[PDB]
């Protein structure tokens, strides 16, 4: 819903009377099909003068603080990826402080790509005051659990150790045995664990054809703390989608209950898209088994 | 000095046997004249396999941690601007830890623009182990002072308030009175103070034509702490250079001695370039007057 009022042609989305969403305001030979930085600057200067903050939720692009009168905060969110809960808490904290300055402070939120990052961090603010991928949905769920239970603060810090990964309904995906997935565990932009199933060196494969599980014994698993990314790379032509991976996870280990995490086919970032509902059947899922150090 | 060895055409600079400087590795429709991300990844994978870390000193653009096998740290340095001393200490600690991890570990350093930020942050490591604008030079000097006196730590935290700004040898620059400069004080991407001399509202102008001084009473100046940037905006057609401003500063308030900071014509970001040595004469300068709260 482009903002076509008052002679404007920006890709804005006036989500709430005090919260504005838009796309990345670009400069140079990129204003033809995207927002021009100066035009949107003028738009939000003639509407709210010295009463806006521009949240640039881009870990990959930034323009200058000076354009928006040096009121710009950058949240390092990767495309199709979630922010850390510390990032979400700091985000909502600075937003609440901004709205406490006076009654007519608005906020502009954008990201370079689609309304995944801006959607996530506008819905997060929406439910704090009251998305594309299911990782963002589950992170909004994490933030609501924090908001209503562990009041606007970090959960009880749990350091968990992952011990095995169970894959449900593997008949159809992969070569046929499940020994093609590649594991990558990322914590704070750091690859803390990787393994390849075909070589079977850092992990072992124990396929049980009775229940269609190819549970992989994940020896000496990392003691993950905080937000974790687990992507599954494959070498058998799986339908790679977002961020060039068959499917990836994003979760906070402080929210895991009873040291078990199962992600249904629908959560499972990338299989959730309906266009690939033929290699991942309805019962497809990945179960993560945890341990307490 | 581009790296033409081993069939490569990269814009590298092998500064030391274990430190590498290069330009930003770009992707998309930019590899025609800039560094291709995949090509540089291949170069530093076949040269240093799993024994390097790439430092991205760009506050305006980043690509993805995944390309360099999730060994990438971003330092938020603005173009034609200096890093914070906390950032410099964190970077130097990171480099020291990386080199202590193994005897083969290398570092790759780049920035999007010219070799100002990469030059700054490579000379900082060069002086710790053993530059475009002069503020980067003064910050390398700040780091050498910290390294050799207040050993590799911050100096005694000093917070001071600017009481007035003295402009030396103004006969020729500006309208002829000095009532065209505009002040902008930026601390941690925050416009903490601004003023316009022509209106004479936030500051008062006291032109002392006897000594060619237009010292401006900076009433109720900010209580600055840490790293401060001071840009001088003008509306009399000054030869705007870097950052689109007549001249700006970048100074740490902890390093001020005797509560005074005079900036000679040579330091004075933008007057430093000899092409403008006709409106800023040899005695041009700015003096920062401080007061202890």
Residue numbers in the entry:
A (entry chain A), B (entry chain B): 192 to 321, 349 to 511
Please quote the paper that reports this structure.
Voltage-sensing phosphatases (VSPs) dephosphorylate phosphoinositide (PIP) signaling lipids in response to membrane depolarization. VSPs possess an S4-containing voltage sensor domain (VSD), resembling that of voltage-gated cation channels, and a lipid phosphatase domain (PD). Membrane depolarization drives a rearrangement of S4 that turns on catalytic activity in the PD to dephosphorylate PIPs in the inner leaflet of the membrane. To identify additional coupling determinants, we performed cryogenic electron microscopy (cryo-EM) on the Danio rerio VSP (Dr-VSP) and obtained two structures: a low-resolution monomer structure in a nanodisc and a high-resolution PD dimer structure.
Compared to Ci-VSP, Danio rerio VSP (Dr-VSP) with the active site cysteine mutated to serine (C302S) showed better protein expression and stability. We therefore incorporated Dr-VSP (C302S) into nanodiscs for the study with cryo-EM. One class of particles yielded a structure of the cytoplasmic domain in a dimeric form at a resolution of 3.0 Å. This structure resembled prior X-ray crystal structures of the isolated Ci-VSP cytoplasmic domain15, with the E350 gate (E411 in Ci-VSP) occluding access to the active site. The dimeric interface in Dr-VSP buries 744.5 Å2 of surface area and involves 21 residues from each monomer, among which 4 hydrogen bonds (E251/G253, G253/E251, Y261/E461, and E461/Y261) and 5 hydrophobic interactions were observed. A similar, albeit smaller, interface is observed in Ci-VSP crystal structures. While diffuse density was observed in the expected position of the nanodisc and TM region, these features were not well resolved in the final map, suggesting flexible attachment in the resting/inactive state. Cryo-EM on Dr-VSP yielded both a high-resolution dimer of the cytoplasmic domain and a low-resolution monomer structure in a nanodisc, which provide structural evidence that a full-length VSP can exist in both monomer and dimer forms. The high-resolution dimer structure reveals residues and interactions that are involved in the dimer formation of the cytoplasmic domain.
